[PDB]
Amino acid sequence: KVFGRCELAAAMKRHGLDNYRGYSLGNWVCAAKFESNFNTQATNRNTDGSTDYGILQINSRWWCNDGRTPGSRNLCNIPCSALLSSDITASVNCAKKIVSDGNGMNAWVAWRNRCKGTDVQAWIRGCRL
Ligand code: NA
Structure with a gap:
């Protein structure tokens, strides 16, 4: 799913982000x-051999299990493919x-x-308050 910007803002808000x-x-x-x-299906293999998954590019070395990443810790206890769903719940919980x-959001x-240090309010322009 490719989210609309305001659609994703609403979904993230619903989940208390x-x-x-x-x-x-x-x-x-x-x-x-x-x-x-804004694409839930996005995957990107990293130079380190891990892969980042979904709307928030959650990593397979630390956070989710993808079956192919050496050293995987799976701290979110979830398969990485669950982070690709049109339902962003699992990505938000992780x-x-x-x-x-x-490090807070510096992990992304x-x-x-x-984003850091910029006018991030611009990214919710037009979205229901
Ligand atoms: Na991988």
């Missing part, structure tokens, strides 16, 4: 834009754990490099 660990909703929409281009770790490289 707005202001989760202090990160306003625009941060989460911005992250998803630059991590997956993101909540991820963002609760020491696209957030750190493209």
Whole structure:
């Protein structure tokens, strides 16, 4: 599923991401834009041999099991393919754990490099308040 921007904002809000660990909703929409281009099916193999999965590009070395990543810890206790669903629930539940770790949203490289320090409110322009 390729989400509309405001559609994803609504879905993320429904799941309580707005202001989760202090990160306003625009941060989460911005992250998803630059991590997956709002595409739940997005997968990207990493140089390290892990793969990033879904709307928020959750990694197979630490967070989910994809059956092919050496050193997999599976801290979210989920198959990585579950993170590709049109239903973002599993991705959100795992993101909540991820963002609760020491570095916060800095774990998402696209957030750190493209969203952090910018006017992230722009990413929810037009979306129901
Ligand atoms: Na992999």
